[PDB]
A paper describes a structure:
Seneca Valley virus (SVV) is an oncolytic picornavirus that selectively targets cancer cells by recognizing Tumor endothelial marker 8 (TEM8) as the host receptor. The structural architecture consists of four capsid proteins forming a protomer, 5 protomers forming a pentamer, and 12 pentamers assembling into a pseudo T=3 capsid, approximately ~32 nm in diameter. We used cryo-electron microscopy to investigate SVV under acidic conditions and in complex with TEM8 at physiological pH, identifying multiple uncoating intermediates.
The A-particles obtained in both conditions are expanded by ~5% in diameter compared to the F-particle. On the capsid exterior, the A-particle[P] had the following partially ordered regions: the VP1 HI loop (S229), VP1 BC loop (A65), VP1 Loop II (G97), and VP2 residues V59 and D67, while the A-particle[C] exhibited similar behavior showing partially ordered regions: VP1 HI loop (T230) and VP1 Loop II (P95-G97).
Residue numbers in the entry:
A (entry chain A): 1 to 12, 14 to 19, 21 to 27, 29 to 258
B (entry chain D), G (entry chain D), H (entry chain D): 14 to 38, 63 to 72
C (entry chain B), E (entry chain B): 1 to 60, 67 to 238
D (entry chain C): 13 to 279
F (entry chain A): 1 to 12, 14 to 19, 21 to 27, 29 to 104
């Protein structure tokens, strides 16, 4: 029919040309679609007080504990820090240390807007049989407390106690709870183009776009360290999500 | 609203269940208007 | 006193899509208002209703989104493609990208065209839509009998062709594997009825742009998992 | 099809026009002062309530499909790109810390009926194309040699945006994706208009203010970016006409300013 | 009969901040009344609103809480400090100590001064507040353009300077690590506009005392863990 | 502005000098802040009837069972008894008995 | 009042849940008055 | 109806418990009529 699509705003079934007005029969709603769990990352389990990674760039011969901790955000991250370029180690054995990375494939498969906001609901699942553990979390912009104290000649890491929530699960159990949107920024920028500092900043790297941080540890004294490593899984959900402006979608190769 | 089935009883208070913004005191609109 | 109870067979189970809440841990937190941000989204159909561009293989990357009219023809449509949403031509359009993440769809697809060439040219085109058959129709004589319409170059260079929805079932699958009657729904083709008259001093070979979108009665039902292939 | 819009002491004329696209909401002009500060703000006045004009590179047959150029806003004012000179607006910008404003632009071309081609212009929000992959803004001298940006798989995948080097402690990963890819086939989602060679000459858009905070820093914000891309390569009969030109005009709307201080300096 | 039930996935869990009570073990106990004790506290902001003293490095412990005016000057403020609550100067003030245990703050800081010297002296001072910039302003000419005020020695020897709150976000972080725009908020400085006239027989070199506190619209949001460093 | 802080009771935003009266947005309340768990002490577990520690000073060669029991108080304690000076054994191996604190 | 979420049902009696003193029969006041 | 005993309380909503068809807007009959 007559129209002018160069103007952009085109008009708007078969009743117009030849109709059929098939009756309705809301599964695409933003609030409904995003309410379901999905894996985020897999992390080790602590057995003593750890040293948080230093900010980049990290020089050779720097002592720290890497592989633990994990942010709560869909945007790409590296070494438990915000990042922009997603990457992976597809190459064979090399040298140095390998940096853990994460990303929300399912979220970005339909991330067709710019700004987002919702509540987060976290849960944790163990992997090794009959494993006992616990979880700890702190808000954005805070810091992880190091060092340990002595009780009856046993070194208890400080992270056993704090004003932030703690969770103890029975042998072979699971954890779950819901946290509030606590970042300073009003909404989460899916893609950004600003700078966080007046000088020496990196374009397009947001500062406090997340929900917090999480870690896992065993309720034992530091005098009972073991050798075999342990692992833990993490899942997240979104509650009352909202979107605020259109955007693009990931490109699909034509190979 | 949302993927929530329970419609009989909410135990914890709304303020402790969901965040709330502090006061400062079908039919789908189109995202483009052409005057 | 204690209330008698009997735990069921599915206690201590974890469901990734259970419609229920969880206990709060750090409640009683306020947040800044967001009434200043305009353009809030409510349903992804709003974005699905927006036109976008298609792709084509081009002669022997080469995936220009337009088709160029040749000089001499041979009893054959300029371009034709199936109506299966898993087809390559629908890959990058918003409708195809969104639908690929759902199982069932329902409604009328919408196709829009636009001409790009010298102002003082003339011509006439024919658009056709053939439901499923044993063999894809080729000749203009065959094409004419099926549903069709005639497009005339004039002041307005754009035209919209609405593909009717006919199928033996209320819903239809979104991706085709066996090409059963439940997924495939025929073909679409473009035929040059006349010969385009290029005015003098206008060099040659105009081009046509394809615009596709969803109709006003589109719908999707069942969510599914995604393909992370785009990360590699 | 003949209308003129007057603002301040300057006016613009349109021999052809389809209208004005109002973007997300009706009446983008309406706005309110921010809420993340207390000091009284500075508002609009006649000195800044007017248009501004600039120039772009020429269009040549050699250009292929999907090539593009970008003009960040308001960073164009600060960089003096394309000869644009904000004057009073720039002077006021350099003497403030917080800003909030809308935008309203128009682009014109001099295509004649004896040419074939198409152009697409849109206001892509929250993008970074000006910066080189190294992590430094593209200089005015560098922007001249290359008149148009060449589309490539890297840009399509968003694999070459600025990043942070890890350091000798780690091993270099293989970068393959980023959240700022460019998808040419879907650019029409943002407000846009098709600048065809046989239908019109000038296009225009009206956009409101957006951002993840009620106000953004005035020295780094890059909310809106103006993008021009070529769909149908230019072609015409030899000897008729050569390489048309391009121009554009800008005008802020209902701005606010906060945080007075001396002139900005770096180091 | 028994009521069917289904325990959830998070049974037998222990939360250190769960908002719920526990079963009593030794209830039904009375206690003596406490209506005789005056001065009950309800909110720590009441204590946060009380002025206190600051610290300064002094010339080469040496952390006297006052600043002494020199005789000859050189185009430079007598004392300046950032507006980051993690700065050393804010360590022992009540506002700094309390805020260090919370994540986000909001409101206007308050600064108060007082003169200590001979009665029959005279002078004039200038106070400045510079939002974030590429370089910290130094000269009086620069300082004058920004927000400022002039203090005159007279019958009243005390003056209060209110630091306005301007930021791109509703809330701000309490401790700075990267010095991002979300934590740092500029600098404060003191400049001697004139030369202080010491009356005869009054020896020299008066002193100034710094008083800091919280404004009337201060606020803190998120509790966090503490630092036990004070025990060592 | 004019004031006299030597008197102690000072008066009381930007509306007074230049204002801004940012609207409220009670996390510091005494009742709310102190309601959350925190570790207190770690103790051994008995396996028989024990002898409670004797009051100070305890002479050399006194038979008792130490390391068990624990008070419920925030104030510093030593050997499961009230105390005033908090202390710890940061020194290396020594002699005698180490007092839990 | 306090970090308590439940607002629907209290099982045990108040006397057995909290201590009670036996009878002997926003707006914030300032802790200092200057006559 | 059916092998269902509970007749006092249904927790989840009907829409989330059973499917529903969307609108398009003793005594036993015999399966054969002989005119």
């Amino acid at each position: 029919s007559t129209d002018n699509a160069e103007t952009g705003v085109i008009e708007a079934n078969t009743d117009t040309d030849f109709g059929e007005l098939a009756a309705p029969g809301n599964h695409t709603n933003v609030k409904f679609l995003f309410d379901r769990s999905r894996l985020l990352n897999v992390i080790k389990v602590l057995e003593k007080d750890a040293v948080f990674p230093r900010p980049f760039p990290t020089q050779e011969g720097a002592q720290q504990d890497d592989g633990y901790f994990c942010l709560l955000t869909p945007r790409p991250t590296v070494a438990s820090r915000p990042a922009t370029r997603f990457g992976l180690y597809a190459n064979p054995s090399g040298s140095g240390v390998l940096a853990n990375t994460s990303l929300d494939f399912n979220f970005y498969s339909l991330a067709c807007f710019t700004y987002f906001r919702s509540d987060l609901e976290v849960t944790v699942v163990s992997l090794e049989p009959d494993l006992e553990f616990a979880v700890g979390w702190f808000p954005s912009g805070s810091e992880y407390q190091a060092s340990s104290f002595v009780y009856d000649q046993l070194h208890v890491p400080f992270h056993f106690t704090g004003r932030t929530p703690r969770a103890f699960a029975s042998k072979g159990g699971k954890v779950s709870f819901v946290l509030p949107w606590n970042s300073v920024s009003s909404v989460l920028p899916v893609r950004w183009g600003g700078a966080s500092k007046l000088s020496s900043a990196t374009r397009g790297l947001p500062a406090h776009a997340d929900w917090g941080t999480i870690y896992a540890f065993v309720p034992r004294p530091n005098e009972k360290k073991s050798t075999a490593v342990k692992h833990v899984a993490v899942y997240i959900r979104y509650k009352n999500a909202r979107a605020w402006c259109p955007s693009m979608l990931p490109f699909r190769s034509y190979k | 609203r949302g993927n929530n089935g329970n419609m009989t009883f909410n135990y914890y208070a709304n303020t402790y269940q969901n965040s709330v913004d502090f006061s400062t005191s079908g039919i789908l609109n189109p995202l483009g208007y052409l005057k | 006193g204690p209330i008698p109870t009997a735990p069921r067979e599915n206690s201590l189970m974890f469901l990734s899509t259970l419609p229920d809440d969880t206990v709060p841990a750090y409640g009683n937190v306020r947040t800044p208002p967001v009434n200043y941000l305009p353009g809030e989204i409510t349903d992804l159909l709003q974005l699905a209703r927006i036109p976008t561009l298609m792709a084509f293989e081009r002669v022997p990357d080469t995936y220009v989104p337009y088709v160029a009219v040749p000089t001499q023809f041979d009893d054959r449509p300029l371009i034709s493609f199936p109506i299966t949403l898993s087809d390559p031509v629908y890959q990058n359009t918003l409708v195809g990208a969104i639908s690929s993440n759902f199982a069932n769809y329902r409604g009328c697809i919408q196709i829009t065209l636009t001409f790009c060439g010298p102002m003082m040219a003339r011509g006439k085109f024919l658009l056709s839509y053939s439901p499923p058959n044993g063999t894809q129709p080729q000749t203009l004589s065959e094409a004419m009998q099926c549903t069709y319409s005639i497009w005339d170059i004039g002041l307005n260079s754009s035209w919209t062709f609405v593909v009717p929805y006919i199928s033996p079932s209320d819903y239809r699958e979104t991706r085709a594997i066996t090409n059963s009657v439940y997924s495939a729904d025929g073909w679409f083709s473009l035929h040059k009825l006349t010969k385009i008259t290029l005015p003098p001093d206008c060099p040659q070979s105009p081009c046509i742009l394809f615009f596709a979108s969803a109709g006003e009665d589109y719908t999707l039902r069942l969510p599914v998992d995604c393909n992370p292939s785009y990360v590699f | 099809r003949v209308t003129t819009q007057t603002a301040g002491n300057t006016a613009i004329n349109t021999q052809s026009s389809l209208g004005v696209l109002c973007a997300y909401v009706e009446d983008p002009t309406k706005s309110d002062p921010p809420s993340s500060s207390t000091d009284q703000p500075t508002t609009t006045f006649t000195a800044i309530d007017r248009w501004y004009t600039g120039r772009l590179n020429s269009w040549t047959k050699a250009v292929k499909t999907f090539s593009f150029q970008a003009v960040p806003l308001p960073g164009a004012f600060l960089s003096r790109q394309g000869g644009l000179n904000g004057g009073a607006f720039t002077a006021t910008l350099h003497r403030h810390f917080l800003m909030k404003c809308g935008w309203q632009v128009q682009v014109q071309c001099n295509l004649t009926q004896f040419h074939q081609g198409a152009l697409l212009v849109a206001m892509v929000p929250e993008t970074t194309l000006d910066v080189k992959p190294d992590g430094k803004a593209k200089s005015l001298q560098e922007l001249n040699e290359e008149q148009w940006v060449e589309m490539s798989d890297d840009y399509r995948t968003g694999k070459n945006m600025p990043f942070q080097s890890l350091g000798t402690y780690y091993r270099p990963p293989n970068w393959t994706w980023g959240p700022n890819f460019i998808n040419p086939y879907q650019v029409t989602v943002f407000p846009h208009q098709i600048l065809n060679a046989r239908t019109s000459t000038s296009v225009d858009i009206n956009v409101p203010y957006i951002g993840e905070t009620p106000t953004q820093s005035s020295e780094t914000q890059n909310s809106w970016t103006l993008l021009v891309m070529v769909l149908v390569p230019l072609d015409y009969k030899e000897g008729a006409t050569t390489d048309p030109e391009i121009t554009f005009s800008v005008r802020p709307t209902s701005p606010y300013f906060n945080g007075l201080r001396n002139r900005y300096t770096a180091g």
